[PDB]
Symmetry: C2
Subunit: 96 residues, 2 copies
Amino acid sequence: MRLTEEEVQALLEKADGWKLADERWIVKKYRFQDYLQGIEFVRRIAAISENANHHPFISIDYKLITVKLSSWRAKGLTKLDFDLAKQYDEVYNQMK
Amino acid sequence: MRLTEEEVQALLEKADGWKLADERWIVKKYRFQDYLQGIEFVRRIAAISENANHHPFISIDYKLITVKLSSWRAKGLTKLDFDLAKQYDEVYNQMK
């Protein structure tokens, strides 16, 4: 079930660091002090994503990891995207 | 030492899968049958990159891993970029 414009705005206001982009994606940048730690973060959130059968787009620009979420089957954002966003935030906070 | 246009063209002709992009970068796309295997590939080439004190840009679009190499200090491509390209190719071939 794709979230409406109003629902997306409401969820985004409670998701610090996540930004609406390309009209239907939420994007967050996670910075690390150690390059390999950024990689470990990627390894962990990838595992979580695979188990959720929901994969984000991830880019690794040295110590800056960019994560982009959206639901292609729903043609936009779903509650799952925001749930995963929080799960990724949790991993980041534990590592930091 | 930045490679000249002629040197880059010569090295690229012997680097299957690697393409010149954005004027001074070499880019390659590595496809996997398993999402987590693509992640493992990233983990391995990141380690190699960290030891070489030379980090590529990496993106993970589901099962497609894109790797982009260049030497910012040399303001272009260096022999090291092509050496790492071969090292990454080796990892990929071993995993496949």
